[PDB]
Amino acid sequence: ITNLCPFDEVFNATRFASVYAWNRKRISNCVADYSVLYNFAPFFAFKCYGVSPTKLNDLCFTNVYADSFVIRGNEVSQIAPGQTGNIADYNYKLPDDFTGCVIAWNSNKLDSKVGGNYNYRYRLFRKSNLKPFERDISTEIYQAGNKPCNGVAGVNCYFPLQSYGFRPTYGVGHQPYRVVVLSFELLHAPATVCGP
Amino acid sequence: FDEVFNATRFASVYAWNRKRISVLYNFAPFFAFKCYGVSPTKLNDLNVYADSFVIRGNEVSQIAPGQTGNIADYNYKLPDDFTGCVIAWNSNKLDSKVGGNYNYRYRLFRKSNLKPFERDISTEIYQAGNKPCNGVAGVNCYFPLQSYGFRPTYGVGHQPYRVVVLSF
Amino acid sequence: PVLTQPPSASGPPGQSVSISCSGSRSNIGTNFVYWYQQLPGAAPKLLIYKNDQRPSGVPERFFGSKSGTSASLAISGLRSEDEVDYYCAAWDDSLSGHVFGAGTKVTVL
Amino acid sequence: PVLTQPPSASGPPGQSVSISCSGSRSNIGTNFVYWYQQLPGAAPKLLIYKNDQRPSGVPERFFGSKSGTSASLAISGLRSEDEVDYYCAAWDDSLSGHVFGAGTKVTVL
Amino acid sequence: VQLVQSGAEVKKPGASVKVSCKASGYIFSDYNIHWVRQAPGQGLEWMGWISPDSDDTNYAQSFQGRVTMTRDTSITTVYMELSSLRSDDTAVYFCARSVGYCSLNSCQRWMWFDTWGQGALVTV
Amino acid sequence: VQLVQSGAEVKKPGASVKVSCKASGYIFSDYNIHWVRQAPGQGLEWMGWISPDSDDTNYAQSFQGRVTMTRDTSITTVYMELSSLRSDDTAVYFCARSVGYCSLNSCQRWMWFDTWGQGALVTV
Ligand SMILES: *[C@@H]1O[C@H](CO)[C@@H](O)[C@H](O)[C@H]1NC(C)=O
Ligand SMILES: *[C@@H]1O[C@H](CO)[C@@H](O)[C@H](O)[C@H]1NC(C)=O
């Protein structure tokens, strides 16, 4: 690869995956710049842990991982190392040790259909907490009482996935914020993704 | 020595006192008394600058000739050649209190590493992007100063250790 | 060099309305802004501190944030508790003193 | 699967008549159900959405809920405007389509 | 809202017919359009939906080689074609505006229709 | 934690105001006590804090030499006075405890008034 890494494909994609099935895209064997990502909208939260967002170009890595999903305004701060929340515990567990960046910005112009955009969901109820950097898809009912409900939408037994549409009449707290997570790791292999 | 050691008020990290110039063992037991060049035992048988500030207990080991870290490469960098002593002692019933102590700040972000024996009392907002942040410390633009409050609940590696570097 | 904000913003019950607060260089965007909710005939208390935390006991529906030299707090649902005064508090470096907003009243529609 | 429901409703006018809509576990019990009525030579119109709500405009005299695999609809009184066929619909993952009921023709006595 | 679709003409089997749905009074690019037919002796039968912002559509497991569904932006009308029609396709055709916006097969559980339209007779 | 202010009392123009508030239930020496006033119908205004382990009473520029501020740690209360009160100063006065403790000028960005005592209004 002699041209730039396809961060335009992961940032300017026409659709984003939902929270409960967040994408895991791998960038490898590509010369990276990290110089074109400020051309987008002013970010709501552009925060990096471990590596400061100034020495990205001259620091050399071996693999880049990109996570991509869309979350409400009230839960942007939940995506953080050592945080407790509805997405922080049940949908996306960021580990306490985290070397990378989290980028959350506003997309209330093409990612919110008037009257409801039910295309995005999250998982409300789970049997336990979630291991860090893990995802799962559930299509069966979750029970909470002392009876196995086993597939009837009744009492004390509920569907796990809950949708949340984005009408434009909503305020800042319930707009769809697109958030990506750029993750790096230690040098255990010869470096290939590196600055020019 | 009585003016700089028992002083009621110790300055913060980035703007440290420089006091120009008894016995020193009549205080609390020392976390680290490691003189370089001159030896502590032959010191009493033997221009003195007395720079004093406060450090979090994790970062006391960063005050040494010729090593990097956090505050070392931004706030107080010792030169490669050193002839002085470093005296770090406990201070937990004076500079720590419930709710936190938001006095003893430290400078966290800087443009580059600083020259040895230099201080810079500034607050202009660091620019961490490409947009020129003239006075707005919003996103990708952060304030330099940051304060670590001291609580008695905190462990041994986070207490405020009053330190003095008696550079000969 | 004092904070300014609209005296009143009207919103229908059931969804969210926003309270805006704009400041200068030395008031907003260099220092943190805090939000105080004042019950009528009582001492005001904390509502929003450091722009992304909340104190304990506050329900998770009060979202305030700042981007440039202005700050905005969004309150969702106005039934019987948000018909109170909201104050925009931040530290002013030039006058070396805390300065406060004019006082915003929120009423249902 | 395919939704099943009785084609005829038996009951004198002036009191409550109950009708049921039965399905399967992959059809009902995981997804919601909705109700429609088809006027003579006209498009179907909404009755119940989210299994227990009524849209704005419809009469408030119609009550329906699901108790398990089947869902029951209760109507109050039989007028001429209530004599149209009533339809039952839901969504099932196993066929990736909107399954619909066969129809219930109601006649006064 | 206003939702009126054009009429249809009785055709002979082994031919293609076009049924057009017209939408007005709302934003055409922020909703879904569903095709549902009424034949005698049976209830409503469901075919598929079109998202009027891209090409992503879905079909039914029964109507796969007989229906093709396309969209338009400047007229804001949805065009649906019936191919290889038989005697079992004698039905009137409803185009229904569905509230909300879904494009996946795990999304349709909240997809309840909002406004329907007057049917057009199609006969073998 | 509780803070109890003094009672309401009317004072004539040209006299002083003796308003005090008592701290109880927490460590007195480890928390700054600010002072916040409120005219009836207007916004809030600031007075200045007390560091209750030394004598450092910073004031605002509008009340630089018009107030007298005193700590009484023997009876765990904090006093203040007003010199030559006018009709513009007819207001209510709160004393508030900020979390943490700092007495420098450039440290108040991490200072918010957590708990507030009851009001005591003074008039002309
Ligand atoms: C995203 O794609 C749109 C449409 O092609 C284009 O107009 C825009 O410049 C792209 N933006 C970025 C950040 O690549
Ligand atoms: C420090 O100063 C205080 C007050 O003057 C005095 O009581 C104390 O003995 C002094 N301690 C030392 C060891 O300097």
Short mmCIF file of C-alpha atoms in Angstrom, two decimals, chain B residues 6-161:
data_model
loop_
_atom_site.label_atom_id
_atom_site.label_comp_id
_atom_site.label_asym_id
_atom_site.label_seq_id
_atom_site.Cartn_x
_atom_site.Cartn_y
_atom_site.Cartn_z
CA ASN B 6 9.59 24.21 58.32
CA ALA B 7 7.90 26.72 56.07
CA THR B 8 4.13 26.59 56.46
CA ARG B 9 3.46 27.17 52.74
CA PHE B 10 5.20 25.18 50.01
CA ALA B 11 4.91 26.32 46.41
CA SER B 12 3.41 24.17 43.68
CA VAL B 13 5.40 22.20 41.11
CA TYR B 14 5.58 24.48 38.08
CA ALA B 15 6.36 27.68 40.03
CA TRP B 16 8.85 26.46 42.61
CA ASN B 17 10.61 28.62 45.17
CA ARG B 18 14.33 29.29 44.78
CA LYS B 19 15.73 30.31 48.17
CA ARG B 20 19.40 31.22 48.29
CA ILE B 21 21.64 30.14 51.15
CA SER B 22 21.90 23.46 61.82
CA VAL B 23 21.06 19.77 61.37
CA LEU B 24 18.56 18.20 58.98
CA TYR B 25 17.80 14.87 60.71
CA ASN B 26 15.57 16.53 63.35
CA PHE B 27 12.52 16.16 61.05
CA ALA B 28 10.23 13.34 59.93
CA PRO B 29 11.98 10.25 58.46
CA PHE B 30 12.98 10.83 54.86
CA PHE B 31 11.45 8.99 51.92
CA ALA B 32 14.62 9.50 49.86
CA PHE B 33 17.94 11.11 50.86
CA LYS B 34 20.19 10.30 47.88
CA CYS B 35 22.93 12.85 47.29
CA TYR B 36 24.79 12.79 43.97
CA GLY B 37 28.50 13.49 43.76
CA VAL B 38 28.88 14.49 47.40
CA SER B 39 28.04 11.83 49.95
CA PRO B 40 25.61 12.36 52.86
CA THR B 41 28.00 10.94 55.46
CA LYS B 42 30.97 13.11 54.44
CA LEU B 43 28.75 16.16 53.90
CA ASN B 44 29.16 17.59 57.41
CA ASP B 45 32.92 16.97 57.35
CA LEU B 46 33.00 18.86 54.03
CA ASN B 47 26.55 28.95 46.20
CA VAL B 48 23.81 26.65 47.53
CA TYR B 49 20.37 26.75 45.92
CA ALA B 50 17.40 25.38 47.88
CA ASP B 51 14.50 24.64 45.52
CA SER B 52 11.44 23.27 47.33
CA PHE B 53 8.08 22.03 46.07
CA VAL B 54 5.62 19.15 46.56
CA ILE B 55 5.37 15.91 44.57
CA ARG B 56 2.91 13.04 44.41
CA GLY B 57 4.51 9.98 46.00
CA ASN B 58 4.62 8.06 42.71
CA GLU B 59 6.70 10.76 40.99
CA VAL B 60 9.36 11.35 43.65
CA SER B 61 11.64 8.89 41.84
CA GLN B 62 11.53 11.17 38.76
CA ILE B 63 13.75 13.74 40.53
CA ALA B 64 17.13 12.33 39.45
CA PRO B 65 19.90 13.48 37.08
CA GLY B 66 19.01 12.54 33.52
CA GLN B 67 15.73 10.65 33.29
CA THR B 68 12.37 11.51 31.75
CA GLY B 69 8.79 10.96 32.87
CA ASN B 70 5.90 13.33 33.53
CA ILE B 71 6.72 16.40 35.62
CA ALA B 72 10.43 15.81 35.07
CA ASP B 73 10.41 16.75 31.38
CA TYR B 74 7.84 19.52 31.80
CA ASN B 75 8.18 21.18 35.22
CA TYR B 76 11.54 20.60 36.97
CA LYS B 77 14.37 19.05 34.94
CA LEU B 78 17.68 18.51 36.68
CA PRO B 79 20.83 18.90 34.56
CA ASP B 80 22.88 15.94 33.38
CA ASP B 81 25.66 16.85 35.82
CA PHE B 82 24.46 17.29 39.40
CA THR B 83 26.27 17.92 42.68
CA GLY B 84 23.33 18.39 45.07
CA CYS B 85 21.04 16.38 47.32
CA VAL B 86 17.34 15.57 47.19
CA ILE B 87 15.40 15.41 50.48
CA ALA B 88 11.85 14.03 50.34
CA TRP B 89 9.82 13.52 53.51
CA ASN B 90 6.24 12.68 54.44
CA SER B 91 3.60 15.39 54.80
CA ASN B 92 0.13 13.93 55.32
CA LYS B 93 -1.22 15.75 58.39
CA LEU B 94 -0.32 19.17 56.93
CA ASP B 95 -0.90 19.25 53.16
CA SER B 96 -3.71 16.67 52.87
CA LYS B 97 -7.31 17.04 54.00
CA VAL B 98 -10.74 15.58 53.30
CA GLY B 99 -12.36 16.83 50.10
CA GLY B 100 -8.99 17.41 48.45
CA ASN B 101 -6.27 20.06 48.31
CA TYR B 102 -6.66 22.00 45.05
CA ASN B 103 -3.63 24.25 45.68
CA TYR B 104 -0.67 22.10 44.64
CA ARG B 105 -1.15 22.09 40.88
CA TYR B 106 1.32 20.90 38.25
CA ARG B 107 1.87 21.68 34.59
CA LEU B 108 0.96 18.66 32.47
CA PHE B 109 1.14 19.68 28.79
CA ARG B 110 3.93 21.71 27.20
CA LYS B 111 5.22 22.31 23.68
CA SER B 112 8.53 20.52 24.33
CA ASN B 113 10.98 19.54 27.04
CA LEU B 114 12.45 22.48 28.95
CA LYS B 115 15.99 23.54 29.75
CA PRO B 116 17.50 22.43 33.09
CA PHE B 117 16.78 24.65 36.12
CA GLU B 118 13.89 26.56 34.58
CA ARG B 119 10.35 27.44 35.63
CA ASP B 120 7.49 28.89 33.61
CA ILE B 121 4.45 30.37 35.33
CA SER B 122 2.11 30.39 32.33
CA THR B 123 -1.43 29.25 31.58
CA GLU B 124 -1.92 29.96 27.88
CA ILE B 125 -4.01 27.18 26.39
CA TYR B 126 -2.08 24.33 24.77
CA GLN B 127 -2.96 23.61 21.13
CA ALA B 128 -3.30 19.88 20.43
CA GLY B 129 -4.82 20.10 16.94
CA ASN B 130 -4.58 22.23 13.82
CA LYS B 131 -7.22 24.88 14.57
CA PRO B 132 -5.60 27.83 16.41
CA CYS B 133 -7.18 27.91 19.88
CA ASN B 134 -6.53 31.51 20.88
CA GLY B 135 -8.59 31.47 24.08
CA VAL B 136 -10.98 28.52 23.82
CA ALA B 137 -10.01 25.33 25.66
CA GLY B 138 -12.76 23.25 24.12
CA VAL B 139 -12.22 19.98 22.26
CA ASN B 140 -8.64 19.05 21.26
CA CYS B 141 -7.50 22.15 23.20
CA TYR B 142 -6.71 21.67 26.89
CA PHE B 143 -5.62 23.80 29.83
CA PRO B 144 -2.01 23.15 30.91
CA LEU B 145 -2.38 23.24 34.69
CA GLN B 146 -3.94 20.31 36.52
CA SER B 147 -4.33 19.73 40.26
CA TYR B 148 -4.16 16.42 42.11
CA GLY B 149 -6.09 16.81 45.34
CA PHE B 150 -4.77 15.05 48.42
CA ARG B 151 -7.02 12.84 50.51
CA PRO B 152 -6.24 10.73 53.60
CA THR B 153 -8.23 7.95 51.90
CA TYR B 154 -5.54 7.76 49.19
CA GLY B 155 -2.70 5.27 49.44
CA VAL B 156 0.98 5.79 50.19
CA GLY B 157 1.85 6.44 46.55
CA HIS B 158 -0.41 9.50 46.30
CA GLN B 159 0.36 11.48 49.47
CA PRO B 160 1.95 14.95 49.09
CA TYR B 161 5.66 14.51 49.74
#
